[PDB]
Amino acid sequence: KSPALDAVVIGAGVTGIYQAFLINQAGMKVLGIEAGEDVGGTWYWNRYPGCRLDTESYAYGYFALKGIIPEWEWSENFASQPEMLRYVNRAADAMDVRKHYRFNTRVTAARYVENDRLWEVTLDNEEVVTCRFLISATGPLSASRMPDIKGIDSFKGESFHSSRWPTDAEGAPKGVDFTGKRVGVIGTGATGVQIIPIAAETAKELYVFQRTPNWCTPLGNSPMSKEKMDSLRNRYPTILEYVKSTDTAFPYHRDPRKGTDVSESERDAFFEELYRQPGYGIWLSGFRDLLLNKESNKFLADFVAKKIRQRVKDPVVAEKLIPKDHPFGAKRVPMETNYYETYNRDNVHLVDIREAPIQEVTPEGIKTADAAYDLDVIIYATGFDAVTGSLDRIDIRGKDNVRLIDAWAEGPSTYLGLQARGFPNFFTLVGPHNGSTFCNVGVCGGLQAEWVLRMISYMKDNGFTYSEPTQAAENRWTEEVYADFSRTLLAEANAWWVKTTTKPDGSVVRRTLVHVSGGPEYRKRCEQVAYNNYNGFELA
Numbered sequence: 034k035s036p037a038l039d040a041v042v043i044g045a046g047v048t049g050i051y052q053a054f055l056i057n058q059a060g061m062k063v064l065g066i067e068a069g070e071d072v073g074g075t076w077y078w079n080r081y082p083g084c085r086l087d088t089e090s091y092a093y094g095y096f097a098l099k100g101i102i103p104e105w106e107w108s109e110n111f112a113s114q115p116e117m118l119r120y121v122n123r124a125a126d127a128m129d130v131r132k133h134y135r136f137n138t139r140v141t142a143a144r145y146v147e148n149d150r151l152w153e154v155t156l157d158n159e160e161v162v163t164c165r166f167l168i169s170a171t172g173p174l175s176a177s178r179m180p181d182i183k184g185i186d187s188f189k190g191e192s193f194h195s196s197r198w199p200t201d202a203e204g205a206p207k208g209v210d211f212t213g214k215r216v217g218v219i220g221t222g223a224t225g226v227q228i229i230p231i232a233a234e235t236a237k238e239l240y241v242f243q244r245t246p247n248w249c250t251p252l253g254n255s256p257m258s259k260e261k262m263d264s265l266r267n268r269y270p271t272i273l274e275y276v277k278s279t280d281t282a283f284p285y286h287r288d289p290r291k292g293t294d295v296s297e298s299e300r301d302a303f304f305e306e307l308y309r310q311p312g313y314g315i316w317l318s319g320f321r322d323l324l325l326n327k328e329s330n331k332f333l334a335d336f337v338a339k340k341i342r343q344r345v346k347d348p349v350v351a352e353k354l355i356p357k358d359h360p361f362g363a364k365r366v367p368m369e370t371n372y373y374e375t376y377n378r379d380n381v382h383l384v385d386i387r388e389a390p391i392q393e394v395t396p397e398g399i400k401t402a403d404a405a406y407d408l409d410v411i412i413y414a415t416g417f418d419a420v421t422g423s424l425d426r427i428d429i430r431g432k433d434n435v436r437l438i439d440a441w442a443e444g445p446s447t448y449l450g451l452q453a454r455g456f457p458n459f460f461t462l463v464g465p466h467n468g469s470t471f472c473n474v475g476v477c478g479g480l481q482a483e484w485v486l487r488m489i490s491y492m493k494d495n496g497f498t499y500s501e502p503t504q505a506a507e508n509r510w511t512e513e514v515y516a517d518f519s520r521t522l523l524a525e526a527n528a529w530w531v532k533t534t535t536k537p538d539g540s541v542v543r544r545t546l547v548h549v550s551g552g553p554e555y556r557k558r559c560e561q562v563a564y565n566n567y568n569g570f571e572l573a
């Protein structure tokens with residue numbers, strides 16, 4: 034029993050469609066499967082007000098950089114979701130990729146057949162296809178999660194998670210006009226932070242329910258003249274080479290200097306300039322020791338904090354938005370268009386819901402431990418189940434009928450962030466130990482799929498039909514990803530990222546759900562392994 038397809042690719046976001054294009058371009062049989070109507074993933078699903086890149090548009094647009102759609106015109110330095118969706122669409126045209134996809138179809142299970150070295154893939158609990166290789170491009174941040182919060186279904190008004198905003202026939206979102214409504218927004222991650230200022234322009238009243246402020250910096254978006262766009266296009270080969278060489282694939286790189294290498298007065302001048310220029314420079318061009326040295330982090334934390342107080346006129350309000358939990362740049366930093374100034378409006382109220390938690394949602398509004406709020410509308414900007422989440426929702430079974438869920442219970446275990454022992458011929462793209470959290474995913478995802486294609490090509494060419502990490506390679510990779518991660522300041526910030534298992538005999542295993550070496554050093558490890566005939570995989 035031999036498989037119908039060389040590969041199934043799950044997902045039609047930017048990673049999936051590109052992976053599918055490469056496999057077919059290499060002369061192989063691929064089937065792509067997508068739950069939504071059409072291409073885009075993130076940019077198909079997220080139609081909330083303010084949705085917009087945090088990556089420079091020309092940097093994220095790997096399909097333009099690579100010469101698949103070089104003629105592409107960006108209208109803004111940080112494109113909005115609608116523009117991003119037209120981008121993914123136009124690229125799906127050039128790649129002629131849609132004819133390889135089933136849409137409106139959800140993978141519900143995937144079972145590795147040991148005797149036949151193949152994957153049985155189940156579609157909406159009915160049809161079953163077979164493939165040599167299973168490749169998930171299921172997304173690091175798809176799979177919305179609701180707040181665990183009592184009474185959700187009683188609200189008598191309109192109610193959404195931010196990733197499921199209803200639209201008109203044209204694709205444009207509806208119920209965007211809040212004129213004369215009282216609006217609740219729960220959550221202040223990068224999603225809430227984009228919505229709240231747009232909500233505030235039309236809402237009669239606006240309540241923001243914040244469990245934990247983030248460090249947010251100004252985005253500094255503006256339009257992109259045709260002249261500048263032509264200029265960028267002309268230097269695409271330089272820009273590409275440059276983003277392939279930085280640690281995050283953003284067009285920034287760390288200052289060579291330590292924080293304490295300049296006076297206090299020089300830091301401030303330096304911080305002041307980056308703060309004012311657009312994009313992630315303030316975070317990504319910082320001092321080399323920004324995420325490794327408590328004191329060097331406090332310099333910048335102190336500085337952004339001072340900026341929050343300058344921008345928010347009310348001092349009690351302003352201190353509630355300054356975080357005390359965590360170091361700056363310890364999470365993907367949300368960037369904003371007039372976020373703080375919004376709280377100077379008369380119709381906008383910040384509700385600290387850590388000191389006074391929500392009890393329940395009510396037919397009339399929301400109820401906290403010390404107040405009630407009549408609300409006409411509620412927006413759940415409460416985030417996603419990250420990296421591993423979209424995989425958990427598929428019943429994935431490997432050798433010996435073992436659940437991926439159970440294999441990764443003590444935390445994700447991979448080789449190269451790409452395969453897992455127990456799960457042969459299975460590739461996880463922009464999953465764990467891969468670096469997604471701080472990546473320009475447009476670029477990182479792209480390069481990861483090219484590497485997977487090269488390994489698939491190698492096997493076809495050698496007539497191999499079996500690949501799986503050795504236990505030793507996977508142990509060494511996984512331990513090493515953790516060691517590097519323990520050396521930065523992210524370790525005591527987000528301890529939920531670390532899973533710690535004191536087994537029953539006394540042994541202690543530590544895994545992080547997050548890779549933090551640079552992309553270049555990652556890709557270098559992958560090429561050393563690829564060239565040395567995939568040293569670390571059993572290949573047969």
Ligand SMILES: Cc1cc2nc3c(=O)[nH]c(=O)nc-3n(C[C@H](O)[C@H](O)[C@H](O)COP(=O)(O)OP(=O)(O)OC[C@H]3O[C@@H](n4cnc5c(N)ncnc54)[C@H](O)[C@@H]3O)c2cc1C
Pocket residue numbers: 043044045046047048049066067068069073074075076079084085086087088093138139140141170171172173174175423426427462463472473474475478
């Ligand atoms: C609002 C938002 C803004 C972002 N902005 C940036 C940014 O500016 N820069 C950056 O680098 N990153 C950004 N990201 C991260 C983002 O995840 C990546 O840029 C990128 O879009 C991920 O692409 P992907 O193809 O890997 O996954 P996705 O875009 O998440 O697509 C995965 C697809 O798989 C589908 N799927 C999942 N399970 C199944 C199944 N069981 N069966 C069938 N289909 C399934 C989903 O429907 C989805 O379409 C942003 C993310 C969000 C949510």
Ligand SMILES: NC(=O)c1ccc[n+]([C@@H]2O[C@H](COP(=O)([O-])OP(=O)(O)OC[C@H]3O[C@@H](n4cnc5c(N)ncnc54)[C@H](OP(=O)(O)O)[C@@H]3O)[C@@H](O)[C@H]2O)c1
Pocket residue numbers: 085086087088174179180181182219220221222223224225227244245365367368414415416417
């Ligand atoms: N390019 C962009 O501008 C952009 C835009 C959107 C998203 N993204 C990406 O998507 C990721 C997720 O961002 P997100 O804003 O969608 O989600 P998120 O960052 O995880 O934030 C969810 C928010 O809801 C709050 N929340 C979670 N559970 C809650 C509960 N049970 N009750 C009340 N409040 C709760 C969280 O608070 P706690 O911290 O207390 O849990 C948090 O502030 C980001 O890291 C970013 O990488 C990027």
